[PDB]
């Protein structure tokens, strides 16, 4: 039969930051897995931590530290197997000194009733219609105006129906409806999100359904899964409730992330130690808790990052 639909493509981003695309059938046929209930590596090998199934004509909407947005057409990415590494995504993102890539959002069209939701390091949020992002410029655009010393930390796509959760470094978390934040333009500063205790910052944005586990992990390698349903509505602007204890043992929160049911998680130290497990291997405890060890660190070694992979569908 004469089938005409173009095959979808898997786009991947590695932890070091190489970007690649591959026809999803070749991606599926080359899957070998094998590798166990958990794994640990000392090699500092690169590994993939982002995977999106997309149309070849789609665009990756890419957001910066400094509140800028760039457009990366998926078709520009190189085609290659699990054997070739691809190209630095920063080949498309002119970063200033110290500026970071913060979010990569696939987009097919700039529909209304879709939004970009942004969270800032100082506790500020904004909601911009996706349609404001429709016309690309090679040199980028403002996505959010930042106050001095502020940084863009989290970005997510929403349909208008989502709850948003913000997580600070002392473990404090709010949860509120996205309808609570009126739409504003790319040039706006946005509005109150979480009232931060002195010296603390926002570390993660989570977008979820109206009131699934949330993984929190801590700088000294402690953490847990707690069901979404156990995070109560806690008002925008408020100081939040305890999402995880940030006890002297634990140290500061490194990340909070919403896990899909089949997700792999990876934990990366600042000494280049890597552990991989399935999310469903991580202990489930309640929110106002210290959690359990899930990476044992040596002297002056901290958990640097927590990544998540859905390689399923």
HEC string of the chain equals CCCCCCCCEEEEEECCCEEEEEEHHHHHHCCCCCCCCEEEECCCCCCEEEEEEECCCCEEEEEECCCEEEEEEHHHCCECCCCCCCEEHHHCCCCCCCCCEEEEEEECCCCCCCEEEEEECCCEEEEEEHHHHCCCCCCCEECCCCCCCCCEEEEEEECCCCEEEEEECCCEEEEEEHHHCCECCCCCCCEECCCCCCCCCEEEEEEECCCCEEEEEECCCEEEEEEHHHCCCECCCCCCEECCCCCCCCCCEEEEEEECCCCEEEEEECCCCEEEEEHHHCCECCCCCCCEECCCCCCCCCEEEEEEECCCC
Give Rg (Cα) of the chain: 19
Residue 218 contacts residue 246 (beta carbons within 8 Å): yes
Q: What tokens appear for 3 in the block?
A: 């089938």
State the pairing for strand pair 253-259/213-218. antiparallel
Q: What tokens appear for 83 in the block?
A: 């054997």
- What's the CA gap between 288 and 245, in Å, rounded? 6
Q: State which approach was used to obtain the coordinates.
A: X-ray
Resolution for this PDB entry, in angstroms: 2.2
Closest by alpha carbon to 175, among 145, 220, 124, 211? 211
- 107-114 contact pairs (CB < 8 A, 24+): 107/58, 107/59, 107/60, 107/61, 107/133, 107/157, 108/54, 108/55, 108/57, 108/58, 110/134, 113/159, 113/160, 114/157, 114/158, 114/159, 114/160
DSSP-assigned beta bridge partners for residue 129: 115
DSSP-assigned beta bridge partners for residue 288: none
Closest by alpha carbon to 266, among 223, 207, 211, 202? 223
Instruction: Kindly indicate whether the domain formed by 1-313 is annotated with CATH number 1.20.140.10.
Output: no
Residue 254 contacts residue 293 (beta carbons within 8 Å): no
Residues 6+ apart with CB under 8 A from 49: 13, 14, 15, 266, 307, 308, 309
Give me the residue spans of the domains in the chain. Answer: 1-313
- What's the CA gap between 155 and 164, in Å, rounded? 11
Could you tell me the end-to-end alpha-carbon distance of the chain, in angstroms, rounded to an integer? 25
Residues 6+ apart with CB under 8 A from 68: 140, 141, 142, 143
């Amino acid at each position: 039969m004469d089938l005409i639909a173009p095959e979808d493509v898997v786009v991947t981003l590695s932890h070091a930051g190489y970007a690649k695309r591959q026809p999803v059938s070749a991606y599926r046929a080359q899957r070998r897995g094998g590798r166990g209930r958990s794994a640990a590596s000392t090699k500092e090998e690169d590994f993939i931590d982002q995977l999106w199934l997309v149309n070849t004509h789609d665009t990756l909407l890419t957001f910066t530290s400094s509140g800028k947005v760039f457009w990366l057409p998926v078709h520009q990415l190189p085609e290659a197997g699990s054997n070739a590494r691809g190209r630095p995504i920063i080949n498309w993102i002119p970063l200033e000194s110290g500026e970071r890539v913060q979010a990569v959002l696939p987009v097919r069209e700039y529909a209304d009733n879709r939004y970009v939701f942004m969270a800032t390091r100082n506790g500020t949020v904004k909601k911009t219609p996706l349609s404001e992002f429709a016309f690309r410029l090679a040199r980028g655009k403002i996505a959010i105006n930042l106050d001095e010393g502020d940084a863009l930390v989290g970005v997510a796509l929403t349909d208008g129906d989502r709850d948003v959760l913000l997580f600070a470094s002392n473990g404090k978390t709010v949860r509120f409806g996205e309808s609570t934040v009126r739409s504003m333009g790319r040039t706006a500063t946005g509005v109150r999100g979480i009232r931060l205790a002195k010296g603390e910052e926002v570390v993660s944005l989570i977008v979820s359904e109206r009131a699934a586990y949330i993984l929190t992990a801590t700088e000294n390698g402690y953490g847990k899964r707690t069901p979404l349903a156990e995070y109560p509505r806690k008002g925008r602007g408020t100081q939040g409730v305890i999402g995880i204890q940030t006890t002297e043992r634990n140290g500061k929160l490194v990340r909070a992330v919403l896990l899909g049911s089949t997700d792999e998680v990876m934990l990366i130290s600042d000494g280049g130690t890597l552990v991989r497990t399935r999310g469903s291997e991580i202990s489930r405890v309640g929110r106002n808790t210290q959690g359990v060890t899930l990476i044992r660190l040596s002297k002056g070694e901290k958990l640097q990052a927590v990544e998540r992979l859905d390689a399923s569908l």
